[PDB]
Amino acid sequence: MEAVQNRIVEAAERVPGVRGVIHLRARYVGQDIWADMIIGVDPENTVEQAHEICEAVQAAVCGKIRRIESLHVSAEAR
Amino acid sequence: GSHMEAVQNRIVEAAERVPGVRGVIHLRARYVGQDIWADMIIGVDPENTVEQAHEICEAVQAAVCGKIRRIESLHVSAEAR
Does the beta-carbon distance from A47 to B48 stay under 8 Å?
A: yes
Residue A39 bridge partners (DSSP)? A21, A75
| Closest chain B CA to residue A40 | B50
Task: Tell whether B55 is in a known binding site.
Answer: no
Which of B49, B5, B44 is closest to B27 using CA atoms?
B5
Task: Tell whether B13 is in a known binding site.
Answer: no
Does the beta-carbon distance from B49 to A43 stay under 8 Å?
A: yes
DSSP-derived letter for residue B81 is -
- The technique is X-ray
Calculate the CA A32 to chain-centre distance.
Answer: 16
Provide, as residue numbers in chain A, all residues whose Cβ is less than 8 Å from the Cβ of B77.
Answer: 74
Which of B1, B81, B79 is closest to B40 using CA atoms?
B79
Domains defined for chain A, CATH in brackets: 1-78 (3.30.70.1350)
| C-alpha distances in Å from residue A45, one per residue of A1, A65, B13 | 33, 27, 29
Instruction: A25-30: list long-range contacts, CB under 8 Å, 24+ apart.
Output: A26/A1, A26/A68, A28/A1, A29/A69
